[PDB]
Structure to design on (364 residues):
């Protein structure tokens, strides 16, 4: 077993390789997109993780695409997150904040001014996002057609990432994870399917990767490269965003560029929940050749698959999603080969304590 051995992840040391994947749960307070004490309890319960990666969290109000997703842009949000990180640290845990801009996976009703959300191009996502009804319950609603960002608005987006990372540092997070996956704004620029721009932010892979690399450079300069992770989903299709006709080459280009910045980690979301073709060991080897920091894998991993690939030297850590929803002490359960609690997917999104903080540990 290597799963229960330590790993240096940039500025922090994880005591094990069992990480909590970023998991949107849509339980924040509105108005204000404010994290809550209940969210604090949930994260605290999971503090034995090698690393907790938070739910996706808005860099700005414009970034919002889901009712109930938290922000890290306002004073009230910063204060609330400070309490949550303090609780995780009281239990000797480590926590990263996942930072996103949802771009076109959003709805006008939750945007500033009730206006169309923004993206690389004016193309509808053709999916749904999660809003709230008049009683605060989660509902699924078709995405609004976005507006293409003007060239002159791009520096603002970079600055919003920079500022959110500054705020993350003040809020007591150990690391930040840039959400460059799953069809959200950074991925909308990366993908030729969602990016039809003719300026320097569209066309070639160098141009499509330009925004994400500008963000990486800004956040490394704001804090430190060893505080910065990035999540990518560069092989396959995610929320209708494919990775284009040269997905492997384009992925390896991006990864070679990221490596130059000396960032803490590369987190690869390998498939969506509906599944897809597995990563080849040859592709994994090509990623290792190009990236010199920690590599985290995710997507329907079992402990067995995680040990296999860590043992093979191809990845360093595994982020578990749904098993972490259901097992606050997943580390201990995996280490002892104990049964896991059953999952209740009906309470993944929205609601309250039920299906959130009521999954038990092995022992009380
Ligand atoms: C309810 C739920 C919410 C999710 N929210 C996020 C998110 O906020 N950010 C993200 O990058 N991935 C998100 N994902 C993907 C997970 O991080 C993770 O990659 C996936 O759940 C791993 O597969 P597993 O659940 O089979 O371990 C989410 C998944 C689920 C099931």
């Amino acid at each position: 077993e290597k799963l229960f051995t330590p790993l240096k992840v940039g500025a922090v040391t994880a005591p094990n390789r069992v990480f909590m994947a970023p998991l949107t749960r849509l339980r924040s307070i509105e108005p204000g997109d404010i994290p809550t004490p209940l969210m604090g309890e949930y994260y605290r319960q999971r503090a034995s993780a090698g690393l907790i990666i938070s739910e996706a969290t808005q860099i700005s109000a414009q970034a919002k695409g889901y009712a109930g997703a938290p922000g890290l842009h306002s004073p009230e949000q910063i204060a609330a997150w400070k309490k949550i990180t303090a609780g995780v640290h009281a239990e000797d845990g480590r926590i990263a904040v996942q930072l996103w801009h949802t771009g076109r996976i959003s709805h006008s009703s939750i945007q500033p001014g009730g206006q169309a959300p923004v993206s690389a191009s004016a193309l509808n996502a053709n999916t749904r996002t999660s809003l709230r009804d008049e009683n605060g319950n989660a509902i699924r609603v078709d995405t609004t057609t976005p507006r293409a960002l003007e060239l002159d608005e791009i520096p603002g987006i970079v600055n919003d990432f920079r500022q959110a990372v500054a705020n993350a540092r003040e809020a007591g997070f150990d690391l930040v994870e840039l959400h460059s996956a799953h069809g959200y704004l950074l991925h909308q620029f990366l993908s030729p399917s969602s990016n039809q721009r003719t300026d320097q932010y569209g066309g070639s892979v160098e141009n499509r990767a330009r925004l994400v690399l500008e963000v990486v450079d800004a956040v490394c300069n704001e804090w430190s490269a060893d505080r910065i992770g990035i999540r990518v989903s560069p092989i396959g299709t995610f929320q209708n965003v494919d990775n284009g006709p040269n997905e492997e080459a384009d992925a390896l280009y991006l990864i070679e560029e990221l490596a130059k910045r000396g960032i803490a980690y590369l987190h690869m979301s390998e498939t969506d929940l509906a599944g897809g073709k597995p990563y080849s060991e040859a592709f994994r080897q090509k990623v290792r050749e190009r990236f010199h920091g920690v590599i985290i894998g995710a997507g329907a991993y079992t402990a067995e698959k995680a040990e296999d690939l860590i043992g093979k030297g191809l990845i360093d850590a595994v982020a578990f999603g749904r098993d972490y929803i259901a097992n606050p002490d997943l580390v201990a359960r995996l280490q002892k080969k104990a049964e896991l609690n059953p999952q209740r997917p009906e309470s993944f999104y929205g609601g309250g304590a039920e299906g959130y903080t009521d999954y038990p540990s092995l022992h009380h």
In short: The chain has one domain: 1-364. The radius of gyration is 19 Å. Residues 21-24, 55-56, 98, 179, 181-182, 231, 269, 298-301, 320-323, 348 surround flavin mononucleotide (CB under 6 Å).
